Amino acid sequence: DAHSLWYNFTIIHLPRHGQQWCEVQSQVDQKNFLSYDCGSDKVLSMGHLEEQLYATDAWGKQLEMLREVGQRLRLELADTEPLTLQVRMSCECEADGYIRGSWQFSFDGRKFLLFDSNNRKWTVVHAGARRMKEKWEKDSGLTTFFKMVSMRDCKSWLRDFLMHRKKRLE
Amino acid sequence: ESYCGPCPKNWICYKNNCYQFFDESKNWYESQASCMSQNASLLKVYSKEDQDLLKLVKSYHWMGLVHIPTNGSWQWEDGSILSPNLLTIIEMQKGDCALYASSFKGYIENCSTPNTYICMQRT
Amino acid sequence: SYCGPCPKNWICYKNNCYQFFDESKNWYESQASCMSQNASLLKVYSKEDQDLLKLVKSYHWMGLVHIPTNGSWQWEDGSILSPNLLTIIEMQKGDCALYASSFKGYIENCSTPNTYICMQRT
Numbered sequence: 481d482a483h484s485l486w487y488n489f490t491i492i493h494l495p496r497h498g499q500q501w502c503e504v505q506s507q508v509d510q511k512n513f514l515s516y517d518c519g520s521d522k523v524l525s526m527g528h529l530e531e532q533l534y535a536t537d538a539w540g541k542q543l544e545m546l547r548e549v550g551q552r553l554r555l556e557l558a559d560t561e562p563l564t565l566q567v568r569m570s571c572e573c574e575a576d577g578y579i580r581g582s583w584q585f586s587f588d589g590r591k592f593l594l595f596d597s598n599n600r601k602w603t604v605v606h607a608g609a610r611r612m613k614e615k616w617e618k619d620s621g622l623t624t625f626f627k628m629v630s631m632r633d634c635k636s637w638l639r640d641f642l643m644h645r646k647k648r649l650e
Numbered sequence: 651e652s653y654c655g656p657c658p659k660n661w662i663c664y665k666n667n668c669y670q671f672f673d674e675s676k677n678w679y680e681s682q683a684s685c686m687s688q689n690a691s692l693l694k695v696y697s698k699e700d701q702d703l704l705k706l707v708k709s710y711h712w713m714g715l716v717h718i719p720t721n722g723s724w725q726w727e728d729g730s731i732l733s734p735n736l737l738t739i740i741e742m743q744k745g746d747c748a749l750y751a752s753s754f755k756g757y758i759e760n761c762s763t764p765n766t767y768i769c770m771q772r773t
Numbered sequence: 774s775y776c777g778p779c780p781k782n783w784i785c786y787k788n789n790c791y792q793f794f795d796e797s798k799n800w801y802e803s804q805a806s807c808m809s810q811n812a813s814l815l816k817v818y819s820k821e822d823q824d825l826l827k828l829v830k831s832y833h834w835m836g837l838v839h840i841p842t843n844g845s846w847q848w849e850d851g852s853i854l855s856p857n858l859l860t861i862i863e864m865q866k867g868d869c870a871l872y873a874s875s876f877k878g879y880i881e882n883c884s885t886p887n888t889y890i891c892m893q894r895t
Binding site: 651652653654655656657658659660661662663664665671703706707708709752 | 782786793830
C-alpha cells in the first residue's frame with residue numbers, strides 16, 4: 481500500500497488583526513494530526529492522540545523543519561512579484577518506496593505554481609506565475625531546499641510514524 | 651598560518667571580528683542592550699569581503715541597523731550610514747529596525763517584535 | 774581570548790578551524806581539496822565544541838565514509854561516527870553524506886557536485 485504526509489502552510493505577509501503569520505495543518509495518510517503555529521513554535525491542536533506520533537524522534541525534527549520552511553517562505557513572500565501564500569508540501573511512499581515529493585503554491589486561493597521534486601521541474605499553473613518560477617528556478621538553493629525536505633526529511637518522518645504506528649499494533 | 655584577533659570567550663573569530671549568535675528572542679532594544687552589556691554591538695555590515703561568512707547564515711536575526719524617520723536612510727548604532735554596495739533591503743514587516751538574512755539581505759521588521767540576534771565586536 | 778592556531782582567513786571557533794568552499798565539486802574532489810592543505814573534510818565529534826554548525830545553511834560534504842555492511846559510518850581519519858551526534862537521513866544507494874544544519878547528514882551520491890567544509894584543529 482501507499483502512505484502520504486501533507487503539510488498545509490498558510491503564510492501571511494503584513495498580518496492585519498490578530499493573525500499569526502505562520503500556520504500549518506498536517507495529515508498522515510490523508511488525515512489530520514497536527515495544527516501548528518510555525519511562527520511562535522506552538523502546537524495549537526494536534527488531534528489524533530492514539531498513535532503518539534509525538535514521542536517519536538521525527539516529531540521534533542518535523543517541527544524544526546516546519547519552522548524553517550515557514551521562515552524561508554516568509555522572506556520569499558516579502559519580495560514577491562495582506563498577501564497570503566498557501567503552500568502544500570507532500571511526500572508519498574508507494575509499495576516499493578517510490579517517494580513522490582511535490583509542492584503546491586497559491587497566493588489567494590488560486591493555484592499558481594507546482595514543483596515536482598522528483599523530476600525537479602517547476603511548472604507554471606497561472607500566467608502571472610511565470611516570473612516567480614524564473615526567480616525560484618534560478619534560486620537553486622531554494623529549489624534544492626524544496627527537493628531535499630520533501631524527498632527525504634518528509635519520507636523520514638513518514639517512515640518513523642509508520643514504523644511506530646505498527647510496533648504498537650503487531 | 652596564524653592567529654585570529656582578541657575575541658570574547660567562545661566567539662566565532664573571523665577576519666579579525668567577533669560574532670555570537672543568541673537563540674534568545676528579544677526585541678531590537680532588548681537585544682541591542684545585550685550586546686552592549688558585553689563590550690559589543692549588534693551585527694554591522696561594512697564589507698562583503700571581510701564578512702563573507704555572513705552568506706553562510708541560516709534564518710533572520712537582528713542587526714544594528716536602524717531607520718532615520720526623515721531622510722529615509724538606514725544607519726548603524728555607531729552613527730555611520732549604510733554604504734550603497736553592501737545590503738539589499740526588503741520590507742518584511744512594519745517597524746524601523748532591520749533583520750539580517752543570509753546573502754547580505756536586510757529585512758525590515760517591527761523593532762518591538764522578539765527575534766534572535768547577532769552581537770559583533772570589531773577587533 | 775584568542776582562537777586557536779588557524780590558517781589565514783579561516784573560521785575559528787573554540788580553536789577549531791573551518792573553511793566553507795563555495796566551489797561545487799564531488800566528494801572525492803572535496804576530499805583531496807582539503808587534503809591538499811593539511812586539513813580534513815569536516816569531522817563532527819562534539820555538538821558543544823562545534824556549536825556554530827547549527828547556524829550554517831545549505832548542504833556541504835563532510836569527511837564521512839560508510840561501510841555498507843554494518844550500515845555504519847566512519848570518518849576519514851579512521852574513527853567511527855560516535856552515536857548521538859548526527860541524525861543521518863537515509864534515502865540511499867548513495868555512499869556519502871552532506872552536513873546540513875542542526876547536526877544532520879544527508880546521504881547522497883558521492884559523484885554529485887557540492888560545496889564542502891574543511892576542518893583543521895591545532
